């Protein structure tokens, strides 16, 4: 397939993969 894409199709091989304190007391848990 690499040969087919490059030798005669003359293009890059396609590759894919499925992909599956005060101020800061208010921000933090402590308050």
């Amino acid at each position: 397939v690499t040969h087919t894409f490059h030798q005669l199709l003359d293009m890059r091989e396609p590759v894919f993969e499925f992909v599956r304190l005060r101020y800061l007391d208010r921000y933090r848990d402590s308050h």
Binding site: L9, D10, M11, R12, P14, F16, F18
Partner: peptide, 22 residues
């Protein structure tokens, strides 16, 4: 080379593509 352009994502439609892949 213009041919070098490739799409970002494939469009595989085979029902058993994933099944055969596992």
């Amino acid at each position: 080379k213009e041919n070098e352009a490739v799409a970002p994502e494939f469009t595989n439609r085979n029902p058993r593509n994933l099944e055969l892949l596992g």
